[PDB]
């Protein structure tokens, strides 16, 4: 979507696996606030928006 009409989505009731993201692209920007990306795969979250 274009930025002025961005597109939200909710994600709940799944087994989130963050190890698929790395295989996407060289990832010109990948930064995390409040969590580290490698220690992402072992935590539990309340509600996840995308």
């Amino acid at each position: 979507a274009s930025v002025y009409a961005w597109n939200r989505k909710r994600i709940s009731n799944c087994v989130a696996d963050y190890s698929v993201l790395y295989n996407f692209a060289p990832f010109f920007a990948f930064k995390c606030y409040g969590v580290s990306p490698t220690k992402l795969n072992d935590l539990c979250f309340t509600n996840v928006y995308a």
């Binding site: 969590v35 580290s36 490698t38 220690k39 935590l43």
Partner: peptide, 8 residues
């Protein structure tokens, strides 16, 4: 110590 890498 759980949700963060050692440097931060």
């Amino acid at each position: 110590l759980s949700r963060l890498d050692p440097p931060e």
